[PDB]
Amino acid sequence: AWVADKARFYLERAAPELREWEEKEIFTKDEIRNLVAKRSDFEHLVLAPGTKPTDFLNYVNWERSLDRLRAKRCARLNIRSVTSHASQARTFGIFERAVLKHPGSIELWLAYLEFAAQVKATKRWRRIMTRALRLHPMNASLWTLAGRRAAQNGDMQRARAHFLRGCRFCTREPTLWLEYARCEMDWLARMEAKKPALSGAIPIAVFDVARKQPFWGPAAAEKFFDVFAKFGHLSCHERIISHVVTTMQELFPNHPCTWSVHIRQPLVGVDTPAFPKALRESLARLKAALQSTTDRKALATKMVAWMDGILAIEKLDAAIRTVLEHTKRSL
Amino acid sequence: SSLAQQLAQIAANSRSSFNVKALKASHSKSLIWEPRVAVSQTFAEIYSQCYEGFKELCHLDSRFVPFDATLFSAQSQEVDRTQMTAEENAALDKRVDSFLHLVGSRLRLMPAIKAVEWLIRRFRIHEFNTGTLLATFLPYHTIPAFVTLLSILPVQRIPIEYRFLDPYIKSLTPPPRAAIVQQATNRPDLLSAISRYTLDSCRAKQEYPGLISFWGGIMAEAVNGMIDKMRSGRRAIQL
């Protein structure tokens, strides 16, 4: 432990900002003595041998709240000469030696990404995201954060880069695959609302490659359909939904999930006279499904869950509502 | 060795630690944690655990909300009691005595023991308020928490009236009611201290039936033994 000699540099670096704040009338001298003592205690806690990511986050939160307090006080005392750049630089320094000391803590990596995104640092955010993905490649949350922020920026090629490396790594759970199909169809909806893409064959290709993965269950394909069924206002949405249903019917013929997609298929983009027409079609499918030879307890639990989802909406007729209740109660 | 006697009185009257081993021992003295863990604990960890304890105590009883502002404050994480003046130390002593009178009823509970552990590990109540702390733990003199408080108490910081506890500090066993009653019949100071503690609580209406039954039993047995001592047969001596 050379921690005193190690923290001497960070205190001597933070000193001239305190000299500027003392030569302005923004912080008084007793308050600056308090800032000196608090930063000194924080540095000698941070550079200690036995340290913790919560200790690094407490120091980050204190420095960021000091920047916010000085911003409020500077706007109140009407000064424009004092800048926040030194505080952002030292907060980046705290975070860089934080991710040096504890690279295996995703809470601290995500706090670093939240800070770098919040003070408008996109290129630095991309570099931090690359380092975090290299250290935690099995983390679907980090991969979806990278891909969704690249899609939110609009660099769809970079979003596909992050997502295809993520689906190359995370193949135990379906989560990142579902989020990639969600992002690709959101790109398809953006390409539609801007008015290949005319076919929209990429989620069908995602399904065809996902057919051979170690998570490939009927529940996983039902999760694929439950992702796909949102935002039906598209062009090839009926093509995608019909391909999912014929894949599940050709592969898992008598599963309750396949009977559930047989129930809930024809209600794609409905909200309105086309609503109860397709509801009567789907209820015919549902009655045939309930009488048919399938695990009725599993199919009934699926249908009462979907019927709670149905009952969550207003603006319907009471006869339809009470016949949903009557068909619910005997399950 | 008159110089060694004067220096022994100075070292016993001194209060703040002045070398690193003394600071580590005085920080190691705790109620809950073992000493090997309690050396290496900053005042944010202790404040988090003991503020969870005080949140439970303040949800139990309503009248702990001024101590939420003055004793268990996030600023009271940082205050060193040995750096404030005599009037600040006396007002802090009044606040501590009021909290101990308030917390004496719930002291079998682990929230209240966590709150007393915060007072002990921050404000050093076992050194600066040994009288009120020892008196508020005296009605619970049959419990392991009293055994631990007796373990962490300094020896020369106990008042003269409670110096019957020295064999029970040398061998860590809870003292019996026979020992407390016999020292109450022998010393008037211990009986006056117990009665002064419970009357100072009962004037502030922070009584509880354990304390009332404790004081009633010990003053009854102490007046019994005191009459059996005072009886003499000679007329002027019995007068």
Partner: peptide
């Protein structure tokens, strides 16, 4: 007052609250 409540909360968190601790003592 000329100070926001969020500014006073940041002042009590960042800078310390020693003066109001002494004020809460002497009551």
């Amino acid at each position: 007052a000329e100070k926001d409540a969020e500014e006073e909360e940041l002042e009590k968190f960042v800078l310390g609250a020693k003066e109001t601790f002494r004020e809460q003592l002497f009551r």
